[PDB]
PDB file of C-alpha atoms in Angstrom:
ATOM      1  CA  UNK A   1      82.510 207.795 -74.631  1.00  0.00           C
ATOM      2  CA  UNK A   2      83.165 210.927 -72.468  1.00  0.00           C
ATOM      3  CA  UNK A   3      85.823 209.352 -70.955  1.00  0.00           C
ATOM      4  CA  UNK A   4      87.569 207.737 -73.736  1.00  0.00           C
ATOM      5  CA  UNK A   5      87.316 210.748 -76.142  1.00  0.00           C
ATOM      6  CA  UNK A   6      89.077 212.325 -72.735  1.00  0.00           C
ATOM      7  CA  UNK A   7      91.755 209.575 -72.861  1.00  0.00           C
ATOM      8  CA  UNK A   8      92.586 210.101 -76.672  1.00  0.00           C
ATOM      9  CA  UNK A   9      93.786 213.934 -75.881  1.00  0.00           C
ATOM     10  CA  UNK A  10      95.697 212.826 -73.478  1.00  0.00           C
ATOM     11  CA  UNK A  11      97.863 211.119 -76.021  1.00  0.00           C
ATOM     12  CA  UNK A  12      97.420 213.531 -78.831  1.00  0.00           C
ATOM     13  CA  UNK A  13      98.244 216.057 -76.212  1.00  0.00           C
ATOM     14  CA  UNK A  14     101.336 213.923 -75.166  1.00  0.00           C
ATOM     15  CA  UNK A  15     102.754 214.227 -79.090  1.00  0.00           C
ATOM     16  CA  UNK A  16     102.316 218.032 -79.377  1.00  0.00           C
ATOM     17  CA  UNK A  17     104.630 218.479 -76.293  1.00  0.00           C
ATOM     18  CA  UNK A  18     106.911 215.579 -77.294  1.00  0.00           C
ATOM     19  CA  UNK A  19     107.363 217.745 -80.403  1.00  0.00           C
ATOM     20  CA  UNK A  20     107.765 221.230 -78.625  1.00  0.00           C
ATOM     21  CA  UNK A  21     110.363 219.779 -76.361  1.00  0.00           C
ATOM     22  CA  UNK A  22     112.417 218.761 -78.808  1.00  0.00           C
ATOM     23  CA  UNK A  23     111.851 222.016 -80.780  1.00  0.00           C
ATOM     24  CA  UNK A  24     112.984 224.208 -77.412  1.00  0.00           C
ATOM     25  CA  UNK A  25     116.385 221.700 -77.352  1.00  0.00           C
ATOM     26  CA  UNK A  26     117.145 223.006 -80.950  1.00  0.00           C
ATOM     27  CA  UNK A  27     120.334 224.339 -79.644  1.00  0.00           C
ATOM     28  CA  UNK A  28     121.265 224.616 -83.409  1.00  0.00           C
ATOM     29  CA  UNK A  29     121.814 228.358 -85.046  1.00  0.00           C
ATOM     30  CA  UNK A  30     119.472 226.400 -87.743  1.00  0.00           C
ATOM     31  CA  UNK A  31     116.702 227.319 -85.385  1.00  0.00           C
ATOM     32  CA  UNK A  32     116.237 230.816 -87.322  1.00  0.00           C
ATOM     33  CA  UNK A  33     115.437 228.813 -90.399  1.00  0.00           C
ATOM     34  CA  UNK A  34     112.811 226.668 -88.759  1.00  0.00           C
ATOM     35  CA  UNK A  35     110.633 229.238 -86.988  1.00  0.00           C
ATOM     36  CA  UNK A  36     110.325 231.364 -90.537  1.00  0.00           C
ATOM     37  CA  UNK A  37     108.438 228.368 -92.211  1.00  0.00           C
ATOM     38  CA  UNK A  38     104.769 230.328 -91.462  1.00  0.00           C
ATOM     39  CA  UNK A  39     101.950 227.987 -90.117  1.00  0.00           C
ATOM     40  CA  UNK A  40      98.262 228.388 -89.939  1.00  0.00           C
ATOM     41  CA  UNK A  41      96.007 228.994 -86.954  1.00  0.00           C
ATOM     42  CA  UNK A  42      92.706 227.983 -86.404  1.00  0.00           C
ATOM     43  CA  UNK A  43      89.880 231.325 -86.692  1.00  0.00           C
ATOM     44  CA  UNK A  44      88.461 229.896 -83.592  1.00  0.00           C
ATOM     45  CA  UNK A  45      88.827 226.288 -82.087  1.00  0.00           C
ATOM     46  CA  UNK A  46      86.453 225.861 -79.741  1.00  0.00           C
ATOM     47  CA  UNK A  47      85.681 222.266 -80.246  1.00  0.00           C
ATOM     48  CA  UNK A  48      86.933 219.031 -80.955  1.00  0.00           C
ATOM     49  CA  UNK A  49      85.516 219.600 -84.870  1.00  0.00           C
ATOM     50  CA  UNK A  50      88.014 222.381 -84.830  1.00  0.00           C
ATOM     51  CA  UNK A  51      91.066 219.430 -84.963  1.00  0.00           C
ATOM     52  CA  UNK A  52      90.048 219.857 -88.703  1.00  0.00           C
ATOM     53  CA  UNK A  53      92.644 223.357 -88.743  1.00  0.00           C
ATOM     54  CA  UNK A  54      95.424 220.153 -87.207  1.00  0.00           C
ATOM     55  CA  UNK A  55      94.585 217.888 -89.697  1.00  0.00           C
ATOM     56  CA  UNK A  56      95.200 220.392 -92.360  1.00  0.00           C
ATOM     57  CA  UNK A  57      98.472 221.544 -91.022  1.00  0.00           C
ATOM     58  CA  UNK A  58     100.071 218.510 -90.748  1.00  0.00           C
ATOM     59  CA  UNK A  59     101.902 218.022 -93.791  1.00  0.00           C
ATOM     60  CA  UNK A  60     103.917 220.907 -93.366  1.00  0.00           C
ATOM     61  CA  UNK A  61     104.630 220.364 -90.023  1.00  0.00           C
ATOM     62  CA  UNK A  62     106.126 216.814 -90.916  1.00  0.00           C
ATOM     63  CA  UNK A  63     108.356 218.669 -93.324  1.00  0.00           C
ATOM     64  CA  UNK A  64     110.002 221.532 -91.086  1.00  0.00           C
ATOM     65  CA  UNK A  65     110.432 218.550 -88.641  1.00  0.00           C
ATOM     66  CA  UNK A  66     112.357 216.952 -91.395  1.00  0.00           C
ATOM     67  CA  UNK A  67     114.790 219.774 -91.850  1.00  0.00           C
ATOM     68  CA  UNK A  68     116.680 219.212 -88.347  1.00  0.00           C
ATOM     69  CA  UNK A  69     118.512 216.446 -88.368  1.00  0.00           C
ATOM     70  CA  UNK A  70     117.791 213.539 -86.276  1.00  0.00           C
ATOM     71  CA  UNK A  71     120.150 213.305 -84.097  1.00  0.00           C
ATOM     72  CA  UNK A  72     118.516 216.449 -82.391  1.00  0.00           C
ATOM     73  CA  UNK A  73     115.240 214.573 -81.399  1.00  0.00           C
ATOM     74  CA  UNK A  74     114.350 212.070 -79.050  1.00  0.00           C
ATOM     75  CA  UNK A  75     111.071 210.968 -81.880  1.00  0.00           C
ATOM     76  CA  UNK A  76     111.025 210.354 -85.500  1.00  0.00           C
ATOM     77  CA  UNK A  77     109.204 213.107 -87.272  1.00  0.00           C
ATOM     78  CA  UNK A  78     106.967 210.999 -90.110  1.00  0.00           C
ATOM     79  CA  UNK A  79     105.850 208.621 -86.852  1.00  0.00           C
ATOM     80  CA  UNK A  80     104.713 211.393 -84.473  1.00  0.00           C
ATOM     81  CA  UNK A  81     103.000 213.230 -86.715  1.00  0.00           C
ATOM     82  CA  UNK A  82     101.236 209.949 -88.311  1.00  0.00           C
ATOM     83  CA  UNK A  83     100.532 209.063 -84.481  1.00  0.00           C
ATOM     84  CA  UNK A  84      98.430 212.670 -84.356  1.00  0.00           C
ATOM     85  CA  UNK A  85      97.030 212.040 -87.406  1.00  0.00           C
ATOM     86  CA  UNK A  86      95.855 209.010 -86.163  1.00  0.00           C
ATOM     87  CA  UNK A  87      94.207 210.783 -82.933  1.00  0.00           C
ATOM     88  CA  UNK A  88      92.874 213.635 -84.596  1.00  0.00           C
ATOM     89  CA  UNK A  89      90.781 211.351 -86.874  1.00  0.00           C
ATOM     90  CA  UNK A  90      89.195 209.528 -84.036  1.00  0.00           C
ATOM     91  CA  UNK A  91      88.622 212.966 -82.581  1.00  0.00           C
ATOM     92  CA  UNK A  92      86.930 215.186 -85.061  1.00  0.00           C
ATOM     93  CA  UNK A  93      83.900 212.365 -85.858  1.00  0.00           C
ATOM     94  CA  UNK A  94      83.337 220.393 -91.771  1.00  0.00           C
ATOM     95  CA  UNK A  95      85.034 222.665 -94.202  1.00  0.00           C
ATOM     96  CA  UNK A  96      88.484 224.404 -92.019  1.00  0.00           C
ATOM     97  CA  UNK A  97      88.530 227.989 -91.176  1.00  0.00           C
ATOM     98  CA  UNK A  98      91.811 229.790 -90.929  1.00  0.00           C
ATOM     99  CA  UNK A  99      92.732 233.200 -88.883  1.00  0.00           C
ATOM    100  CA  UNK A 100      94.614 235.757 -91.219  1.00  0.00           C
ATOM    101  CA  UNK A 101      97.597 235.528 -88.896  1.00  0.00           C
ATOM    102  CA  UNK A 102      99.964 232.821 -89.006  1.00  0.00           C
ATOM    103  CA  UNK A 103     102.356 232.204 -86.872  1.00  0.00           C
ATOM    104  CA  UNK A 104     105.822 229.984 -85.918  1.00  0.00           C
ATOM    105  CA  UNK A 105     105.844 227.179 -85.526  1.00  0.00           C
ATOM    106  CA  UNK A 106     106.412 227.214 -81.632  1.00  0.00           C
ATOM    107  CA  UNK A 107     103.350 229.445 -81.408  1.00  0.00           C
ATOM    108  CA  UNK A 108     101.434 226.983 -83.607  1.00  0.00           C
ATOM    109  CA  UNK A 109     101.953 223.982 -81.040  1.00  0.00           C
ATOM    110  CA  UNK A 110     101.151 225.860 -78.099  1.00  0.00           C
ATOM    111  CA  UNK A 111      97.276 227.115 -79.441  1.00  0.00           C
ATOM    112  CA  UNK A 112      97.158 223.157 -80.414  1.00  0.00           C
ATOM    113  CA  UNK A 113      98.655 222.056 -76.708  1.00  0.00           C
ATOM    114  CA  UNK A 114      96.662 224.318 -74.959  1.00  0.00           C
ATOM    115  CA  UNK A 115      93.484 223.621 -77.328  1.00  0.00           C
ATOM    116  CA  UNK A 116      94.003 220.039 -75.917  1.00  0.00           C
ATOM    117  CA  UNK A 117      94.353 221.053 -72.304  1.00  0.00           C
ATOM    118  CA  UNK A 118      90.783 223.419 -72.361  1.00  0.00           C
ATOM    119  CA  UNK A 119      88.737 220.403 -73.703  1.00  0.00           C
ATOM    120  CA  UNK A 120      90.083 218.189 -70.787  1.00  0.00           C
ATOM    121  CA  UNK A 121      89.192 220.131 -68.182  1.00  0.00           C
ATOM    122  CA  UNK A 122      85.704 220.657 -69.754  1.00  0.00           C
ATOM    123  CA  UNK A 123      85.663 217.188 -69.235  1.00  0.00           C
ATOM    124  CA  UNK A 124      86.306 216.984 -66.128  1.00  0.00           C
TER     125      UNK A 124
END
């Protein structure tokens, strides 16, 4: 239960960097136009109930995905963010709680990334 809660990260973990990789490949002047579309960070996120501030965000992350066009991704933006869906509902088993800052969408991967990272070593 430990261990396979531990197992889904690793794959939800997998999808947030799939994402930022091909987000730091944008070798498109677009890029400016991406990274003003404002996301939402978590007040705290301490715990896997905390995926609820993910959950939440995940619409709008589809959607700024959308904007570049594919041929500048290795992963189709509707299925890797329906895969994290998918792992964030098997995660969280709440209302949300949102920091006044938001932030780009870079940023916004990495607190998720590293989020995922903290909770696996905990478990470890």
């Amino acid at each position: 239960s430990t261990k396979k809660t531990q197992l889904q990260l690793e794959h939800l973990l997998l999808d947030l960097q799939m994402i930022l990789n091909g987000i730091n490949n944008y070798k498109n002047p677009k890029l400016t136009r991406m990274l003003t579309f404002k996301f939402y960070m978590p007040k705290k996120a301490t715990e896997l109930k905390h995926l609820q501030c993910l959950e939440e965000e995940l619409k709008p992350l589809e959607e700024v995905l959308n904007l570049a066009h594919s041929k500048n991704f290795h992963f189709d933006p509707r299925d890797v963010v329906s895969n994290i869906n998918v792992f964030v509902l098997e995660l969280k088993g709440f209302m949300c709680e949102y920091a006044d800052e938001t932030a780009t969408i870079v940023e916004f991967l990495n607190r998720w990334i590293t989020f995922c990272q903290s909770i696996i070593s905990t478990l470890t």
